[PDB]
Symmetry: D2
Subunit: 377 residues, 4 copies
Amino acid sequence: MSGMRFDTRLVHGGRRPSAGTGDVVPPIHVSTTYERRAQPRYFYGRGENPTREELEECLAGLERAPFATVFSSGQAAAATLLSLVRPGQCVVSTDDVYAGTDGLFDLAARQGVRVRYADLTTPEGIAAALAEPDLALVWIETPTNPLLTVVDVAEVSRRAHERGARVVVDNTFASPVLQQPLALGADVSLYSTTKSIAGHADVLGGALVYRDADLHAAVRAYRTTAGNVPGALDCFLVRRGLHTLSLRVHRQVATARVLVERLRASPVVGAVHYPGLPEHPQHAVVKAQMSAPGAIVSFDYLGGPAERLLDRFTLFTCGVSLGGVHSLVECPALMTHRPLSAEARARRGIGESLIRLSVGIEDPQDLAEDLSRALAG
Amino acid sequence: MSGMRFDTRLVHGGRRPSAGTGDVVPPIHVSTTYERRAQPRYFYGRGENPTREELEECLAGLERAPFATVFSSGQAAAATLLSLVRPGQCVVSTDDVYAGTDGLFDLAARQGVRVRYADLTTPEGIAAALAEPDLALVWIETPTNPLLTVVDVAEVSRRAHERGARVVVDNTFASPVLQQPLALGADVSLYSTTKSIAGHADVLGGALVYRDADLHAAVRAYRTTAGNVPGALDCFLVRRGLHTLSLRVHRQVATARVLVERLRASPVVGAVHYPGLPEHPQHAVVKAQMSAPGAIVSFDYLGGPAERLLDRFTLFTCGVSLGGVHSLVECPALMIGESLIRLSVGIEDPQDLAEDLSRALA
Amino acid sequence: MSGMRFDTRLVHGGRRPSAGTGDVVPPIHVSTTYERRAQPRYFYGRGENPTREELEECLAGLERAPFATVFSSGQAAAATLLSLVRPGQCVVSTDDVYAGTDGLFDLAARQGVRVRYADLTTPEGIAAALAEPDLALVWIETPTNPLLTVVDVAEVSRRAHERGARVVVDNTFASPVLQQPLALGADVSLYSTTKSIAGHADVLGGALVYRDADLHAAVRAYRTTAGNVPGALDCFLVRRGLHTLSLRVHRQVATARVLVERLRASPVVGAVHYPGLPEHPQHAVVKAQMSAPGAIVSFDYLGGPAERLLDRFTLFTCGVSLGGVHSLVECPALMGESLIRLSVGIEDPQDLAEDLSRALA
Amino acid sequence: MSGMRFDTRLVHGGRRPSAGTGDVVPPIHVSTTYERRAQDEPRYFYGRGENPTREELEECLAGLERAPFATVFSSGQAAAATLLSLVRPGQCVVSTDDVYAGTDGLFDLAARQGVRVRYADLTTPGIAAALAEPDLALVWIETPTNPLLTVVDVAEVSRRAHERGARVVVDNTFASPVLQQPLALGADVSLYSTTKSIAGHADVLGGALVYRDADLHAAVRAYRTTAGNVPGALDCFLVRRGLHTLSLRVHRQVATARVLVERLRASPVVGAVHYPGLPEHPQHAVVKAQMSAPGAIVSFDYLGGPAERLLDRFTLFTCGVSLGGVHSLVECPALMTHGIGESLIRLSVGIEDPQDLAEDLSRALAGG
């Protein structure tokens, strides 16, 4: 795939043509076991599988990276990377990370990993955070959920590498269509492929994309031992969804922009959060590192109880997750951030009436009409 | 899905709620049999299946039609419709029809059906064609393969209905994104969903979309008896591909236009066939019945035997079929001049495809 | 697979090695299209598919036959075979065929095929039946549904071939574990693989198994033109179920014998139909052509409306189809008026016997 | 499934009715996301946490051991990793010396987290010494062992371990719940690679834990959700589908293994033959007390020359690792997976015809 552009690699990356039969779509390798005398690289499915390898080759290609490793889930990918941090070492992350990531951070702390939360949006926040001794890993999620703030990956990576730390970007929100963490200076891109990469809300998966060969050996050794491998049929569905990733993301972004303007015009809407708004507090950073501002929107609803707003949607689905072809709506205080106390949410800037939209690929006018009907301004 | 626009119907058409569990993507119904005391519409998988029905509901909705029936393949859909023509009756069709369709025509002829091929692009061709006695079915493929000629569906349908005949359009090439045969006056839209509807070259399927309730009973009776039904996992894959149909088709068309301009400037290219060219012999009809001119292109290669060109592609795949995410190239005569080449445009980067095409031609 | 016994062929028949990777289970070929320059037998999925071919090789091997062809369903396999009969020619069939088969016979008749139903259990029935002019096909279902009548395949085949007719046996009920129609002299074995061959009630399929090369060309030409091909994922599920076919059938038969003993001892049961009973009117034929008497049983219920009996089962499932791991019960007249049919699954025989007894009570 | 016998539970365990349509085989729930307003009782939020197809498989597995809980995983390793994650810094795990290589791999990781791992001989009243360890949290029993097929008395070790307050897990992958019931024997957890005989068709990876403790249940589910080592729905469907025929396959495999053992005992190029069913097996009394049949794994010392040459001669047995599937497998632990001689050979007996398998084995042993 040398010289081929992004949209071509989506279709042909890892597409091994089939010797003898010539299948355009590679066959699905379900076998757990391999005949030793018929080859000698394939021994057992937990360690080796061609369908899985083809997906990894495709993902790596999307970032022009030498390596990728896929997992049973996004959580499993994060767990694997975090497992490389030793007791006594430090991970610096931000406060507002994905609840699952925080869940993993809690597990790591109980094994003696130091987790330090920080403000990575200011020079003083960054300097303070990276002053931590034995700093092993800087964990960046950008844009963040659900307030959609962004962290300057290139700048944090520069400062972090001065301290000898590894930098990972959870790039699930943006996808490699919109953001290229390795090109920005990060060491690892982390994905829940469950979201926009597979894109059809019908399979779980995770991925790490990176360039370091020692990291590659460590990641592969842990996956084989921990056994957090995806099934071949799952890899097939992720790979199949991947073909249309740039098509889907481009449509989702265009519709999100339309919905943001509807929200700004509604009398029952307060603050509107979107990386693309000119008045976004980190607009220069968004423009510098995202080719488009994404398909997630959040806003403060002023018109009455959030539960009633959620009940009025007839096209948007009320549920968690994001990135899929079906548009979704949730209220973080009632759903994704319900386990937190009201005081914890207040401290994080997550109001009771904050609403989050994940824009799918439905007709933008249908989505706009459903939103207006629900808002009932 | 009333009031919902096309792209919304692609995502939510037939997206039946799961009571209790609340699944957004409906679960895949693989069971061949059903407990009778637990219900009473479902008896046996060949007759009834919820996953298959959801796909049919989606397809019917894309044409705002009351009925759709899916099949194990496009050929099976065609066979089913053709089975309704009785011995002694006549089918009139476009001359360049799909070889499989012609294969079916040969079978029908051996059953006492009269098959007549005709030029349906002229008023004289149509009048001559539709003068056949016992005319039961007019079989229109438009645009045609591989010269991409176009037939006026509304006009042929008007004349055919005066003779009481049924009109089917094989709408595989254009897809319902670009052409709406029922809205143009046809009685049936026929699809190989194997091509652009499923779109990922990993499943076979067919479909009929139509409005007549008597036709519906006959089509379903034949499918149940002949058993040319698709599997549930196949319906799942077709339905999954359908979500992105308008995304894929719009991209394929945009890139086809880019390739056509590259072809027109190549000195080893002669005639270029594409419904979107201003000088296309039926361009007025294209503008009237297609919302965009499609993703299939054909052209005369002047540089020698087609094999010389075909061996040089490094991104296009040399193989048959069309409509998929992977770009395909073939020589119809090998796989209509000896050096006529047909392109099926996929969703790769247009500049990569244009470079591969230019490299092969040079 | 030469020299390998039946149970081995179930596991390794058509199990083509994967060059390079060495997969023990062959990978699933979903691709509809093939690169021409990368080979040249594979052009398009409706015509050619390695996963489908592997299943066909396995099925042919189970009857030591050169050819097999699989289809989207048992009905499609039957329809394909029926398409070879010309208007004006005659098909002779057993009177007790599958309802779907009767549906196909009606379709064929509306195209000018003559269908004659006959008693193929007596010498006079056979002689009368096979006297039809232009006899093209003799259609044997044995044991029959739902009365479990049995037809002597070797004898009918002998007489039919004298008349130049082709003989097909619908071998769905028995499966190739219990009955081998080609070895008995028939020309074609027909299967709904939907039933015991796939065995898990989760995929539709059909198959024809035969030896004639001209028939092969005709069958494949029709399948390609009619497009009644199965998908690769479906072929995968059928092939996967096939591994355990003899294990499942042996268990089902053993349990069926226990249930038959229960039925015969019930005061609310009249006639009991089962090929293995000494008093079955064709028991000598059963002993000569079936290695075991099958897993299907039917009987007359005398205790009241069939619906009342059906409602009382708590383990048997009330539904159509047969051959699967789940035991099924149906009333043919609703789905004599009081005839009940059992399809025995692989549950514990004592659990199934208790359920049947509670229901009859 | 109350009152139903084992073979019935294989077919109907977890076979949840489909409201409205009445599907006999439950539909495959592939959706990762769930509509919140569509649930009378809100149980499904997100696929990593909840999935009906996965739950039906778990319900079936739990039912096979008459246990209240089961949890399935992306692999056997992931099931083991989950259980091992619950051992805290400062605590001790005691294990059978000859454990599965992957289990040893996990033990190495745990040791780097401040867990003390002690290997022991649990076949002799070895047990007392082993269980004298301070802070003993977990006793890890694999029985029969691989590849020498020695057996550990589960009830006895469980008795001694519980006096010390330790948890007892049995890796029951080799025997399967058809032949051995660790929870009925006194253990706290049954651990499976369902990749092997439970799925049985060598076409899906999976793992499982089966247990009774509700506090354990909460911890195991919390870890699986956070670590994300969950299986896909299509994989659960394939494991569940394979499970239907589990007792049929195992009974056949055992019968054929007994035939092969007799063939092996008659060979001039075979030394020691290892099989739990042999009368002279050193733990024969324990085998009879805790296994309903002696299993489908056989190993033996090959005396005829280099093992690599022997492996090349099989034409029906497949040379490869893993076990329990419908296809018979052969390996040489010293050359492949690993008192294990250079010429020790292990057979995993499949469901092929016993006479075909015996002839292939005899042909390979004879050479020529």
